[PDB]
Amino acid sequence: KVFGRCELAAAMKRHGLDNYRGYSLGNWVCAAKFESNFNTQATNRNTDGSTDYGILQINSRWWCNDGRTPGSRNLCNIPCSALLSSDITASVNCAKKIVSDGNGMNAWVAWRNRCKGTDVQAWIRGCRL
Ligand SMILES: [Cl-]
Ligand SMILES: [Cl-]
Ligand SMILES: [Cl-]
Ligand SMILES: [Cl-]
Ligand SMILES: [Cl-]
Ligand SMILES: [Cl-]
Ligand SMILES: [Cl-]
Ligand SMILES: [Cl-]
Ligand code: NA
């Protein structure tokens, strides 16, 4: 599924991601924009052989099982395919773990490089929330 901007903001808020660990909703929408362009089915293969999955491009090195990332963990206790669903529950619940791991949203390099320090409220501007 390719979410609309405000549609995704609303779904993230319903799943409790707004201000989670102090990160306002616009931070999460901005991250999803640059990770996946709001496409739940996005996948991308990393140089180390791991793969990133879903709207927040969650990595199989640590967070989900795909059966093809040697030496990896599955700390969200999910198949990586669950991160591609039109229902964002699994991605949100796993993102909550990731953002709590110590480095906050810097875990998403694209958030650090493209969202951090910017006017992230623009990503939710105009949305009925
Ligand atoms: Cl689509
Ligand atoms: Cl957009
Ligand atoms: Cl915001
Ligand atoms: Cl594996
Ligand atoms: Cl594990
Ligand atoms: Cl699995
Ligand atoms: Cl949803
Ligand atoms: Cl980047
Ligand atoms: Na894994």
Tab-separated table of N, CA, C and O and ligand atoms in Angstrom:
chain	number	residue	atom	x	y	z
A	1	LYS	N	0.862	-1.206	0.000
A	1	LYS	CA	0.000	0.000	0.000
A	1	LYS	C	0.882	1.234	0.000
A	1	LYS	O	1.878	1.279	0.715
A	2	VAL	N	0.525	2.231	-0.802
A	2	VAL	CA	1.173	3.536	-0.756
A	2	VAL	C	0.227	4.467	-0.015
A	2	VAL	O	-0.860	4.787	-0.510
A	3	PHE	N	0.624	4.879	1.185
A	3	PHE	CA	-0.178	5.780	1.991
A	3	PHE	C	-0.091	7.200	1.460
A	3	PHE	O	0.935	7.627	0.929
A	4	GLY	N	-1.178	7.941	1.645
A	4	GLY	CA	-1.095	9.377	1.584
A	4	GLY	C	-0.394	9.927	2.809
A	4	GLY	O	-0.303	9.287	3.857
A	5	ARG	N	0.108	11.149	2.679
A	5	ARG	CA	0.856	11.767	3.769
A	5	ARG	C	0.019	11.863	5.047
A	5	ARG	O	0.423	11.388	6.115
A	6	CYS	N	-1.142	12.512	4.966
A	6	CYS	CA	-1.970	12.657	6.160
A	6	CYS	C	-2.568	11.326	6.591
A	6	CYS	O	-2.749	11.091	7.791
A	7	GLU	N	-2.869	10.448	5.633
A	7	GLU	CA	-3.337	9.108	5.967
A	7	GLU	C	-2.324	8.375	6.841
A	7	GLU	O	-2.693	7.734	7.835
A	8	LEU	N	-1.041	8.460	6.486
A	8	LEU	CA	-0.023	7.780	7.275
A	8	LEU	C	0.137	8.440	8.635
A	8	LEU	O	0.278	7.750	9.653
A	9	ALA	N	0.139	9.775	8.670
A	9	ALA	CA	0.211	10.483	9.944
A	9	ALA	C	-0.881	9.997	10.886
A	9	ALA	O	-0.627	9.713	12.061
A	10	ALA	N	-2.106	9.883	10.374
A	10	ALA	CA	-3.220	9.443	11.203
A	10	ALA	C	-3.021	8.013	11.685
A	10	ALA	O	-3.320	7.696	12.842
A	11	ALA	N	-2.549	7.129	10.802
A	11	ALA	CA	-2.340	5.740	11.193
A	11	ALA	C	-1.238	5.630	12.236
A	11	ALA	O	-1.363	4.871	13.206
A	12	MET	N	-0.156	6.388	12.057
A	12	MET	CA	0.919	6.386	13.042
A	12	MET	C	0.428	6.891	14.392
A	12	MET	O	0.785	6.339	15.439
A	13	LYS	N	-0.399	7.936	14.390
A	13	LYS	CA	-0.941	8.447	15.643
A	13	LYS	C	-1.854	7.422	16.296
A	13	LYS	O	-1.785	7.209	17.513
A	14	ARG	N	-2.716	6.762	15.522
A	14	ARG	CA	-3.597	5.781	16.145
A	14	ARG	C	-2.800	4.659	16.791
A	14	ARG	O	-3.237	4.095	17.801
A	15	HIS	N	-1.632	4.331	16.242
A	15	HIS	CA	-0.780	3.294	16.805
A	15	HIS	C	0.215	3.829	17.833
A	15	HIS	O	1.129	3.098	18.224
A	16	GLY	N	0.050	5.070	18.288
A	16	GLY	CA	0.800	5.556	19.429
A	16	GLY	C	2.199	6.043	19.140
A	16	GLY	O	3.013	6.140	20.064
A	17	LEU	N	2.516	6.318	17.884
A	17	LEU	CA	3.859	6.718	17.515
A	17	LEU	C	4.085	8.215	17.669
A	17	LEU	O	5.237	8.657	17.651
A	18	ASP	N	3.020	8.998	17.840
A	18	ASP	CA	3.157	10.443	17.959
A	18	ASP	C	3.738	10.803	19.324
A	18	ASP	O	3.150	10.488	20.365
A	19	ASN	N	4.903	11.452	19.310
A	19	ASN	CA	5.675	11.792	20.498
A	19	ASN	C	6.248	10.580	21.222
A	19	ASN	O	6.686	10.691	22.373
A	20	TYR	N	6.296	9.428	20.569
A	20	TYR	CA	6.902	8.257	21.185
A	20	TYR	C	8.397	8.499	21.371
A	20	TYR	O	9.092	8.905	20.438
A	21	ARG	N	8.882	8.289	22.595
A	21	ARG	CA	10.264	8.599	22.964
A	21	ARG	C	10.614	10.055	22.663
A	21	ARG	O	11.777	10.399	22.439
A	22	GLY	N	9.603	10.921	22.661
A	22	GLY	CA	9.808	12.336	22.435
A	22	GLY	C	9.867	12.771	20.990
A	22	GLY	O	10.139	13.952	20.730
A	23	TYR	N	9.618	11.874	20.040
A	23	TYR	CA	9.698	12.202	18.624
A	23	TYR	C	8.306	12.524	18.096
A	23	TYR	O	7.440	11.648	18.015
A	24	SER	N	8.100	13.786	17.734
A	24	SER	CA	6.806	14.229	17.255
A	24	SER	C	6.433	13.500	15.968
A	24	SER	O	7.280	12.983	15.237
A	25	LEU	N	5.134	13.502	15.681
A	25	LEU	CA	4.608	12.763	14.541
A	25	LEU	C	5.298	13.136	13.233
A	25	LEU	O	5.549	12.265	12.391
A	26	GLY	N	5.607	14.417	13.030
A	26	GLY	CA	6.271	14.819	11.799
A	26	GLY	C	7.619	14.160	11.585
A	26	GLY	O	8.027	13.936	10.443
A	27	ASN	N	8.338	13.860	12.670
A	27	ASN	CA	9.594	13.126	12.539
A	27	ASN	C	9.368	11.762	11.911
A	27	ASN	O	10.165	11.315	11.076
A	28	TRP	N	8.319	11.065	12.350
A	28	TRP	CA	8.022	9.725	11.858
A	28	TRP	C	7.545	9.756	10.418
A	28	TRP	O	7.912	8.886	9.623
A	29	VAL	N	6.725	10.747	10.068
A	29	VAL	CA	6.265	10.877	8.688
A	29	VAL	C	7.433	11.217	7.773
A	29	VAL	O	7.576	10.646	6.687
A	30	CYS	N	8.291	12.145	8.201
A	30	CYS	CA	9.475	12.492	7.423
A	30	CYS	C	10.354	11.268	7.202
A	30	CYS	O	10.826	11.022	6.087
A	31	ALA	N	10.587	10.486	8.257
A	31	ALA	CA	11.405	9.290	8.107
A	31	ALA	C	10.785	8.346	7.086
A	31	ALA	O	11.474	7.813	6.212
A	32	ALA	N	9.478	8.117	7.189
A	32	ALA	CA	8.834	7.199	6.260
A	32	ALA	C	8.896	7.726	4.835
A	32	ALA	O	9.054	6.953	3.886
A	33	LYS	N	8.768	9.041	4.656
A	33	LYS	CA	8.856	9.612	3.318
A	33	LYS	C	10.170	9.235	2.660
A	33	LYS	O	10.201	8.758	1.521
A	34	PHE	N	11.275	9.478	3.352
A	34	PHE	CA	12.573	9.263	2.733
A	34	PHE	C	13.024	7.815	2.774
A	34	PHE	O	13.848	7.420	1.945
A	35	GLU	N	12.476	7.004	3.681
A	35	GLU	CA	12.803	5.581	3.683
A	35	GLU	C	12.075	4.829	2.573
A	35	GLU	O	12.674	3.970	1.919
A	36	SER	N	10.782	5.114	2.372
A	36	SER	CA	9.938	4.266	1.540
A	36	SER	C	9.033	5.027	0.593
A	36	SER	O	8.291	4.386	-0.160
A	37	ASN	N	9.023	6.355	0.639
A	37	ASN	CA	8.028	7.147	-0.076
A	37	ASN	C	6.612	6.685	0.258
A	37	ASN	O	5.704	6.737	-0.575
A	38	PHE	N	6.421	6.274	1.511
A	38	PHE	CA	5.133	5.877	2.077
A	38	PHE	C	4.617	4.548	1.530
A	38	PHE	O	3.439	4.232	1.699
A	39	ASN	N	5.482	3.739	0.922
A	39	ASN	CA	5.108	2.456	0.327
A	39	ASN	C	5.424	1.327	1.305
A	39	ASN	O	6.595	1.051	1.592
A	40	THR	N	4.379	0.651	1.799
A	40	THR	CA	4.593	-0.463	2.721
A	40	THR	C	5.380	-1.606	2.095
A	40	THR	O	5.988	-2.385	2.829
A	41	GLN	N	5.386	-1.734	0.771
A	41	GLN	CA	6.041	-2.868	0.123
A	41	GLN	C	7.494	-2.594	-0.247
A	41	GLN	O	8.136	-3.453	-0.852
A	42	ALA	N	8.033	-1.442	0.131
A	42	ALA	CA	9.422	-1.128	-0.176
A	42	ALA	C	10.376	-2.135	0.459
A	42	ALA	O	10.237	-2.490	1.629
A	43	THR	N	11.363	-2.577	-0.318
A	43	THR	CA	12.470	-3.385	0.162
A	43	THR	C	13.754	-2.869	-0.462
A	43	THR	O	13.757	-2.364	-1.587
A	44	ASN	N	14.856	-3.020	0.261
A	44	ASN	CA	16.151	-2.637	-0.285
A	44	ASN	C	17.249	-3.479	0.347
A	44	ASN	O	17.294	-3.643	1.567
A	45	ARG	N	18.151	-3.977	-0.492
A	45	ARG	CA	19.208	-4.895	-0.086
A	45	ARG	C	20.451	-4.103	0.304
A	45	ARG	O	20.903	-3.234	-0.450
A	46	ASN	N	21.000	-4.406	1.479
A	46	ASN	CA	22.175	-3.721	1.997
A	46	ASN	C	23.440	-4.450	1.564
A	46	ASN	O	23.420	-5.639	1.241
A	47	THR	N	24.554	-3.713	1.574
A	47	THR	CA	25.822	-4.285	1.133
A	47	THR	C	26.210	-5.501	1.966
A	47	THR	O	26.875	-6.414	1.458
A	48	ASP	N	25.814	-5.532	3.238
A	48	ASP	CA	26.173	-6.639	4.111
A	48	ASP	C	25.296	-7.867	3.905
A	48	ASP	O	25.519	-8.882	4.567
A	49	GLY	N	24.319	-7.813	3.002
A	49	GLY	CA	23.441	-8.933	2.752
A	49	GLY	C	22.129	-8.882	3.499
A	49	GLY	O	21.227	-9.673	3.182
A	50	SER	N	21.999	-8.000	4.487
A	50	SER	CA	20.705	-7.781	5.116
A	50	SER	C	19.780	-7.031	4.154
A	50	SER	O	20.196	-6.529	3.106
A	51	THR	N	18.512	-6.946	4.533
A	51	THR	CA	17.505	-6.266	3.730
A	51	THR	C	16.675	-5.381	4.644
A	51	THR	O	16.434	-5.734	5.803
A	52	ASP	N	16.252	-4.224	4.127
A	52	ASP	CA	15.354	-3.311	4.824
A	52	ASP	C	13.940	-3.477	4.278
A	52	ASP	O	13.749	-3.583	3.062
A	53	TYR	N	12.946	-3.430	5.174
A	53	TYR	CA	11.567	-3.759	4.821
A	53	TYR	C	10.580	-2.699	5.296
A	53	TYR	O	10.607	-2.286	6.459
A	54	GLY	N	9.652	-2.334	4.415
A	54	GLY	CA	8.462	-1.609	4.821
A	54	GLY	C	8.630	-0.107	4.857
A	54	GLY	O	9.635	0.463	4.418
A	55	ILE	N	7.604	0.543	5.428
A	55	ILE	CA	7.514	2.002	5.395
A	55	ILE	C	8.678	2.671	6.093
A	55	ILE	O	9.019	3.815	5.767
A	56	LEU	N	9.246	2.019	7.110
A	56	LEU	CA	10.376	2.550	7.859
A	56	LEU	C	11.652	1.759	7.606
A	56	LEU	O	12.648	1.945	8.311
A	57	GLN	N	11.664	0.918	6.584
A	57	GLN	CA	12.885	0.264	6.119
A	57	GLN	C	13.667	-0.365	7.271
A	57	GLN	O	14.852	-0.110	7.493
A	58	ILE	N	12.967	-1.232	7.989
A	58	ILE	CA	13.516	-1.911	9.155
A	58	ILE	C	14.393	-3.070	8.695
A	58	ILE	O	14.007	-3.857	7.828
A	59	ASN	N	15.562	-3.207	9.328
A	59	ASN	CA	16.679	-4.013	8.834
A	59	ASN	C	16.676	-5.414	9.443
A	59	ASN	O	16.568	-5.569	10.663
A	60	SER	N	16.835	-6.435	8.589
A	60	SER	CA	16.863	-7.824	9.036
A	60	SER	C	18.129	-8.203	9.796
A	60	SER	O	18.175	-9.301	10.360
A	61	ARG	N	19.150	-7.344	9.821
A	61	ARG	CA	20.349	-7.632	10.602
A	61	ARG	C	20.002	-7.802	12.072
A	61	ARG	O	20.575	-8.658	12.753
A	62	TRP	N	19.064	-7.004	12.582
A	62	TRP	CA	18.718	-7.011	13.995
A	62	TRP	C	17.263	-7.321	14.283
A	62	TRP	O	16.972	-7.910	15.326
A	63	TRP	N	16.332	-6.905	13.425
A	63	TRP	CA	14.982	-6.652	13.895
A	63	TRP	C	13.935	-7.650	13.441
A	63	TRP	O	12.911	-7.766	14.113
A	64	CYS	N	14.139	-8.348	12.328
A	64	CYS	CA	13.131	-9.268	11.820
A	64	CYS	C	13.838	-10.443	11.172
A	64	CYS	O	15.025	-10.367	10.842
A	65	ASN	N	13.105	-11.543	11.003
A	65	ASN	CA	13.653	-12.720	10.348
A	65	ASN	C	13.223	-12.817	8.889
A	65	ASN	O	12.023	-12.853	8.587
A	66	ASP	N	14.207	-12.927	7.997
A	66	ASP	CA	13.960	-13.241	6.598
A	66	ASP	C	14.637	-14.521	6.128
A	66	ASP	O	14.521	-14.855	4.944
A	67	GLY	N	15.310	-15.257	7.014
A	67	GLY	CA	15.931	-16.515	6.650
A	67	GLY	C	17.147	-16.419	5.759
A	67	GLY	O	17.684	-17.460	5.376
A	68	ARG	N	17.582	-15.201	5.399
A	68	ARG	CA	18.673	-15.004	4.451
A	68	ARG	C	19.630	-13.903	4.906
A	68	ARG	O	20.230	-13.215	4.070
A	69	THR	N	19.795	-13.719	6.219
A	69	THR	CA	20.755	-12.755	6.758
A	69	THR	C	21.624	-13.464	7.793
A	69	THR	O	21.336	-13.433	8.998
A	70	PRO	N	22.700	-14.127	7.368
A	70	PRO	CA	23.494	-14.931	8.307
A	70	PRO	C	23.971	-14.142	9.515
A	70	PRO	O	24.470	-13.021	9.401
A	71	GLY	N	23.843	-14.769	10.682
A	71	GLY	CA	24.311	-14.196	11.923
A	71	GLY	C	23.396	-13.156	12.513
A	71	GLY	O	23.756	-12.530	13.512
A	72	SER	N	22.223	-12.950	11.930
A	72	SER	CA	21.361	-11.848	12.314
A	72	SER	C	20.493	-12.227	13.507
A	72	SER	O	20.457	-13.381	13.956
A	73	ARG	N	19.799	-11.223	14.028
A	73	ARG	CA	18.818	-11.387	15.084
A	73	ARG	C	17.435	-11.038	14.554
A	73	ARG	O	17.266	-10.575	13.417
A	74	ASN	N	16.434	-11.287	15.403
A	74	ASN	CA	15.029	-11.031	15.105
A	74	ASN	C	14.421	-10.445	16.381
A	74	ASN	O	13.583	-11.052	17.048
A	75	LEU	N	14.869	-9.237	16.741
A	75	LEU	CA	14.527	-8.680	18.046
A	75	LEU	C	13.072	-8.227	18.127
A	75	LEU	O	12.530	-8.135	19.231
A	76	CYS	N	12.420	-7.963	16.996
A	76	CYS	CA	10.991	-7.682	17.010
A	76	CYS	C	10.140	-8.943	16.956
A	76	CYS	O	8.913	-8.851	17.051
A	77	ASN	N	10.761	-10.114	16.809
A	77	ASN	CA	10.059	-11.399	16.843
A	77	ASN	C	8.978	-11.487	15.761
A	77	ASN	O	7.840	-11.888	16.020
A	78	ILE	N	9.353	-11.134	14.532
A	78	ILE	CA	8.413	-11.143	13.405
A	78	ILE	C	9.138	-11.576	12.148
A	78	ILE	O	10.332	-11.305	11.962
A	79	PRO	N	8.412	-12.197	11.225
A	79	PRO	CA	8.947	-12.326	9.868
A	79	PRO	C	9.045	-10.951	9.236
A	79	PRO	O	8.171	-10.102	9.429
A	80	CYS	N	10.115	-10.730	8.474
A	80	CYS	CA	10.272	-9.436	7.821
A	80	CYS	C	9.094	-9.130	6.898
A	80	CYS	O	8.744	-7.959	6.707
A	81	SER	N	8.466	-10.157	6.322
A	81	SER	CA	7.295	-9.935	5.475
A	81	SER	C	6.169	-9.198	6.197
A	81	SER	O	5.380	-8.501	5.547
A	82	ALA	N	6.049	-9.355	7.518
A	82	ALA	CA	4.999	-8.644	8.241
A	82	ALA	C	5.155	-7.140	8.131
A	82	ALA	O	4.171	-6.404	8.299
A	83	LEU	N	6.369	-6.673	7.870
A	83	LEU	CA	6.652	-5.261	7.712
A	83	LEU	C	6.228	-4.724	6.354
A	83	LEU	O	6.393	-3.528	6.109
A	84	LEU	N	5.694	-5.560	5.467
A	84	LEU	CA	5.238	-5.112	4.158
A	84	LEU	C	3.724	-4.996	4.065
A	84	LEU	O	3.205	-4.572	3.024
A	85	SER	N	3.012	-5.336	5.132
A	85	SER	CA	1.558	-5.349	5.130
A	85	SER	C	0.976	-3.952	4.922
A	85	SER	O	1.579	-2.937	5.267
A	86	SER	N	-0.241	-3.906	4.377
A	86	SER	CA	-0.979	-2.646	4.349
A	86	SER	C	-1.310	-2.149	5.752
A	86	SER	O	-1.529	-0.947	5.941
A	87	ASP	N	-1.361	-3.048	6.728
A	87	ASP	CA	-1.584	-2.714	8.129
A	87	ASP	C	-0.225	-2.431	8.759
A	87	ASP	O	0.643	-3.310	8.780
A	88	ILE	N	-0.030	-1.205	9.261
A	88	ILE	CA	1.294	-0.789	9.728
A	88	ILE	C	1.612	-1.236	11.147
A	88	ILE	O	2.677	-0.874	11.664
A	89	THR	N	0.737	-2.009	11.790
A	89	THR	CA	0.945	-2.368	13.191
A	89	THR	C	2.339	-2.946	13.440
A	89	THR	O	3.041	-2.522	14.366
A	90	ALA	N	2.751	-3.937	12.648
A	90	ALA	CA	4.034	-4.582	12.921
A	90	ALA	C	5.191	-3.602	12.758
A	90	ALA	O	6.125	-3.591	13.570
A	91	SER	N	5.153	-2.776	11.710
A	91	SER	CA	6.198	-1.771	11.527
A	91	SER	C	6.248	-0.795	12.693
A	91	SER	O	7.335	-0.433	13.155
A	92	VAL	N	5.089	-0.334	13.167
A	92	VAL	CA	5.067	0.617	14.273
A	92	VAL	C	5.602	-0.028	15.541
A	92	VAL	O	6.430	0.554	16.248
A	93	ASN	N	5.123	-1.228	15.866
A	93	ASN	CA	5.559	-1.866	17.103
A	93	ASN	C	7.056	-2.124	17.082
A	93	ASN	O	7.737	-1.977	18.102
A	94	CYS	N	7.585	-2.516	15.929
A	94	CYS	CA	9.017	-2.754	15.838
A	94	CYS	C	9.789	-1.441	15.892
A	94	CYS	O	10.827	-1.357	16.560
A	95	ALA	N	9.285	-0.393	15.226
A	95	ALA	CA	9.941	0.910	15.294
A	95	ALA	C	10.034	1.408	16.730
A	95	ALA	O	11.009	2.060	17.104
A	96	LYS	N	9.006	1.144	17.539
A	96	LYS	CA	9.064	1.539	18.943
A	96	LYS	C	10.243	0.885	19.650
A	96	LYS	O	10.905	1.514	20.480
A	97	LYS	N	10.503	-0.391	19.364
A	97	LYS	CA	11.679	-1.040	19.935
A	97	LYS	C	12.956	-0.383	19.430
A	97	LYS	O	13.858	-0.061	20.213
A	98	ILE	N	13.043	-0.160	18.119
A	98	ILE	CA	14.265	0.370	17.526
A	98	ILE	C	14.605	1.724	18.127
A	98	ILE	O	15.753	1.985	18.498
A	99	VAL	N	13.617	2.620	18.196
A	99	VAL	CA	13.872	3.974	18.667
A	99	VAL	C	14.198	4.014	20.150
A	99	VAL	O	14.708	5.031	20.636
A	100	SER	N	13.928	2.931	20.874
A	100	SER	CA	14.256	2.816	22.285
A	100	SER	C	15.626	2.192	22.525
A	100	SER	O	16.021	2.028	23.681
A	101	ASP	N	16.359	1.845	21.466
A	101	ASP	CA	17.575	1.046	21.579
A	101	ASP	C	18.785	1.848	22.034
A	101	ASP	O	19.824	1.243	22.319
A	102	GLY	N	18.681	3.174	22.117
A	102	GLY	CA	19.759	3.988	22.650
A	102	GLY	C	20.087	5.228	21.835
A	102	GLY	O	20.438	6.264	22.407
A	103	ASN	N	19.989	5.151	20.505
A	103	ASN	CA	20.332	6.274	19.639
A	103	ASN	C	19.110	6.992	19.085
A	103	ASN	O	19.243	7.829	18.180
A	104	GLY	N	17.934	6.717	19.638
A	104	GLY	CA	16.747	7.403	19.177
A	104	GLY	C	16.551	7.199	17.693
A	104	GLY	O	16.832	6.130	17.144
A	105	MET	N	16.071	8.241	17.022
A	105	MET	CA	15.790	8.103	15.599
A	105	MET	C	17.043	8.135	14.741
A	105	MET	O	16.944	7.906	13.534
A	106	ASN	N	18.221	8.360	15.330
A	106	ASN	CA	19.443	8.244	14.547
A	106	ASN	C	19.650	6.827	14.032
A	106	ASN	O	20.458	6.629	13.122
A	107	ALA	N	18.937	5.840	14.589
A	107	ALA	CA	18.962	4.494	14.033
A	107	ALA	C	18.614	4.514	12.557
A	107	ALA	O	19.104	3.678	11.793
A	108	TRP	N	17.742	5.432	12.142
A	108	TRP	CA	17.425	5.633	10.732
A	108	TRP	C	18.384	6.691	10.195
A	108	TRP	O	18.203	7.891	10.421
A	109	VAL	N	19.410	6.244	9.474
A	109	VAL	CA	20.392	7.169	8.913
A	109	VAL	C	19.707	8.255	8.089
A	109	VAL	O	20.083	9.428	8.146
A	110	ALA	N	18.680	7.886	7.322
A	110	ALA	CA	17.981	8.875	6.505
A	110	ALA	C	17.250	9.903	7.352
A	110	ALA	O	17.120	11.059	6.935
A	111	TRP	N	16.728	9.512	8.516
A	111	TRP	CA	16.175	10.520	9.411
A	111	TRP	C	17.258	11.501	9.835
A	111	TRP	O	17.062	12.719	9.789
A	112	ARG	N	18.416	10.985	10.261
A	112	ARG	CA	19.492	11.882	10.668
A	112	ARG	C	19.873	12.816	9.527
A	112	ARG	O	20.080	14.016	9.735
A	113	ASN	N	19.976	12.284	8.313
A	113	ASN	CA	20.512	13.070	7.208
A	113	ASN	C	19.492	13.979	6.536
A	113	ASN	O	19.893	14.935	5.863
A	114	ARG	N	18.198	13.714	6.693
A	114	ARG	CA	17.195	14.430	5.920
A	114	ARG	C	16.066	15.026	6.734
A	114	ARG	O	15.362	15.904	6.218
A	115	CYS	N	15.880	14.609	7.974
A	115	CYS	CA	14.778	15.077	8.797
A	115	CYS	C	15.249	15.801	10.042
A	115	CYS	O	14.669	16.819	10.420
A	116	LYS	N	16.267	15.266	10.707
A	116	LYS	CA	16.760	15.834	11.950
A	116	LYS	C	17.123	17.296	11.747
A	116	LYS	O	17.841	17.650	10.807
A	117	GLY	N	16.630	18.150	12.637
A	117	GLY	CA	16.938	19.558	12.574
A	117	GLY	C	16.134	20.345	11.571
A	117	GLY	O	16.338	21.557	11.463
A	118	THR	N	15.220	19.714	10.850
A	118	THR	CA	14.388	20.411	9.883
A	118	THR	C	13.006	20.678	10.473
A	118	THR	O	12.670	20.224	11.568
A	119	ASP	N	12.203	21.437	9.725
A	119	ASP	CA	10.837	21.776	10.131
A	119	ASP	C	9.919	20.581	9.867
A	119	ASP	O	9.117	20.560	8.934
A	120	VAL	N	10.054	19.564	10.721
A	120	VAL	CA	9.334	18.315	10.485
A	120	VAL	C	7.828	18.475	10.638
A	120	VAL	O	7.071	17.650	10.124
A	121	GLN	N	7.363	19.523	11.321
A	121	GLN	CA	5.924	19.733	11.428
A	121	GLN	C	5.283	19.941	10.063
A	121	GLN	O	4.085	19.688	9.903
A	122	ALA	N	6.059	20.373	9.068
A	122	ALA	CA	5.514	20.502	7.721
A	122	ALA	C	4.914	19.192	7.233
A	122	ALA	O	3.976	19.203	6.429
A	123	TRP	N	5.434	18.054	7.698
A	123	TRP	CA	4.943	16.768	7.216
A	123	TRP	C	3.542	16.440	7.707
A	123	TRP	O	2.885	15.586	7.106
A	124	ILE	N	3.068	17.091	8.767
A	124	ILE	CA	1.709	16.882	9.248
A	124	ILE	C	0.844	18.116	9.081
A	124	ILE	O	-0.331	18.098	9.480
A	125	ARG	N	1.376	19.179	8.485
A	125	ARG	CA	0.623	20.412	8.326
A	125	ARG	C	-0.620	20.158	7.492
A	125	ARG	O	-0.570	19.483	6.460
A	126	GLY	N	-1.746	20.706	7.944
A	126	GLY	CA	-2.995	20.557	7.238
A	126	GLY	C	-3.744	19.278	7.515
A	126	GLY	O	-4.913	19.173	7.129
A	127	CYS	N	-3.127	18.301	8.164
A	127	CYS	CA	-3.781	17.021	8.365
A	127	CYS	C	-4.772	17.089	9.516
A	127	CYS	O	-4.504	17.696	10.556
A	128	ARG	N	-5.925	16.462	9.322
A	128	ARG	CA	-6.902	16.321	10.393
A	128	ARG	C	-6.442	15.166	11.271
A	128	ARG	O	-6.444	14.011	10.835
A	129	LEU	N	-6.009	15.474	12.491
A	129	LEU	CA	-5.428	14.461	13.368
A	129	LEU	C	-6.033	14.459	14.761
A	129	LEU	O	-5.801	13.514	15.518
B	1	CL	CL	0.671	0.268	-4.436
B	2	CL	CL	4.427	13.844	0.410
B	3	CL	CL	5.637	17.356	14.161
B	4	CL	CL	18.493	-15.205	8.800
B	5	CL	CL	16.800	-12.918	18.079
B	6	CL	CL	9.843	-15.813	10.838
B	7	CL	CL	-2.740	0.783	9.369
B	8	CL	CL	20.577	9.364	3.886
B	9	NA	NA	17.221	-11.316	11.104
